[PDB]
C-alpha cells in the first residue's frame, strides 16, 4: 500500500522532469552497486525494474546516454531515470527504470537442459533472429554491447518476444581508439578478447551470439572454462589451431606463442546428429577466428536458417502469432540497405 514518489526524467522524449509514482516494491535480483527492485507504476499499472548505477561526477554515464537514444522492439526500454542515495554512504546513484521482462533465454535453456530435452528449433530461430536484429540496430550507431550472453537476453515466454538488456558495458567503438579487453563474460568471449586485444570491433558481439546459438543447440556452453587457457583449448578443439595469419587478425602480439596443435573437429560432429544443417552452417559463419570473416548481424538475419520465420504461414507452437519480425527501419538497415529483399518478405 506504500506509494513512493520521485521526480524523474522520461527515458525518451523531452528532457522534462515529472512526478512518477510506484508501489509494490520487491527485490528481484542483484546488481554490482545494489539490489534490483521490481515496481508497479501507479499511472499505468506497468511493471518496471529499477537498478542502481554509480554516477561518475567527471563524465556522463555511458549506459544512460546510450539507452536514451535507443528505440527498438528487441531492446529493453528505459522508462525513467533519477538519482538517489543507496548502498554506500555519501554516494549518489543513478537509477534506471526499465520495462520489466519476467524471464530470460538462459532460464528457458536450462529448463530444457535439466530435463535432458532439446529446445525446439522454432524457438532457437526466433530468439537468435531477434538477437541479431538488436545487434544490427545498435551496431548501426557504432555501439557494441560487449557483454552478450543468455542471461542478458530478456524473454517473454508467452509471446516469444526477446529484448536485449544490460548496456553497462556497451561502448561506441571508434577505429584507432583503444578499448579495454577485459569486457565480456566467460564462455562468450571472442578469441581476440582472450588474447587481450585493445583494437577490436563490434564483431565480438557476433562471436558471443554464435556461442549463444551453439549453447541452445548443444544444451550446454560450447567453450566452457574458468580460465582463458581452458577456454582456448575448447575453442581450438573445435576450430583447430589458429594460423599465424588468423592470430594477426585477432592480436598480432600473440602470433609467436606456443598453442596446442589440434586439427579442426568437423562441425557436423560438434552437435548431435539431428541438429538442422542450416543451424550448423550458421554457427560456422559466426564462430570464426578472423573477426572480419564473421557475418554481420544483418547478414545473419538473412541467413537461410531463418527462412521458416519468413513463411507467411509460420505459427507459434502454442498457436499464437509470431512477434514483430519485419518492421525494419532505415537506421536498422543502414549497414546493407538492399538486404531488405530477403529480410522483408512479400506478405510484409
Amino acid at each position: 500500500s506504500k506509494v513512493t514518489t520521485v521526480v524523474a526524467t522520461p527515458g525518451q522524449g523531452p528532457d522534462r522532469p515529472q512526478e512518477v509514482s510506484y508501489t509494490d516494491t520487491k527485490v528481484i535480483g542483484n546488481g554490482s552497486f545494489g539490489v534490483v527492485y521490481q515496481a508497479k507504476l501507479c499511472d499505468s499499472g506497468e511493471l518496471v525494474a529499477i537498478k542502481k548505477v554509480l554516477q561518475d561526477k567527471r563524465f556522463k554515464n555511458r549506459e544512460l546516454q546510450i539507452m536514451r537514444k535507443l528505440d527498438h522492439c528487441n531492446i529493453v526500454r528505459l522508462r525513467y531515470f533519477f538519482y538517489s542515495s543507496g548502498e554506500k554512504k555519501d554516494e549518489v546513484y543513478l537509477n534506471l527504470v526499465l520495462d520489466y521482462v519476467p524471464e530470460t533465454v538462459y532460464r528457458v535453456a536450462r529448463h530444457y537442459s535439466r530435463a535432458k530435452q532439446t529446445l525446439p528449433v522454432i524457438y532457437v530461430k526466433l530468439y537468435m533472429y531477434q538477437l541479431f536484429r538488436s545487434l544490427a540496430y545498435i551496431h548501426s550507431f557504432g555501439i557494441c554491447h560487449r557483454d552478450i550472453k543468455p542471461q542478458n537476453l530478456l524473454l517473454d515466454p508467452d509471446t516469444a518476444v526477446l529484448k536485449l538488456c544490460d548496456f553497462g558495458s556497451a561502448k561506441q567503438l571508434v577505429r584507432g581508439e583503444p578499448n579495454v579487453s577485459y569486457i565480456c563474460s566467460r564462455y562468450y568471449r571472442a578469441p581476440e578478447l582472450i588474447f587481450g586485444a585493445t583494437d577490436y570491433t563490434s564483431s565480438i558481439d557476433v562471436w558471443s551470439a554464435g556461442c549463444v546459438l551453439a549453447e541452445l543447440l548443444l544444451g550446454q556452453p560450447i567453450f566452457p572454462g574458468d580460465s582463458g587457457v581452458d577456454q582456448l583449448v575448447e575453442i581450438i578443439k573445435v576450430l583447430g589451431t589458429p594460423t599465424r595469419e588468423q592470430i594477426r587478425e585477432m592480436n598480432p602480439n600473440y602470433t609467436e606463442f606456443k598453442f596446442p596443435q589440434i586439427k579442426a573437429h568437423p562441425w557436423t560432429k560438434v552437435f548431435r546428429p539431428r541438429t538442422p544443417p542450416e543451424a550448423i552452417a550458421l554457427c560456422s559463419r559466426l564462430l570464426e577466428y578472423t573477426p572480419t570473416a564473421r557475418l554481420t548481424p544483418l547478414e545473419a538475419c538473412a541467413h537461410s536458417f531463418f527462412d521458416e520465420l519468413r513463411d507467411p504461414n509460420v505459427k507459434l507452437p502454442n498457436g499464437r502469432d509470431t512477434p514483430a519480425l519485419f518492421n525494419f527501419t532505415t537506421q536498422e538497415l543502414s549497414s546493407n540497405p538492399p538486404l531488405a529483399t530477403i529480410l522483408i518478405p512479400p506478405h510484409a
Partner: peptide, 13 residues
Amino acid sequence: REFRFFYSVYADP
C-alpha cells in the same frame, strides 16, 4: 549466482 532474477516460472528461488 548464474541467474538474473531470483524468481522464474521454470524453477524455485
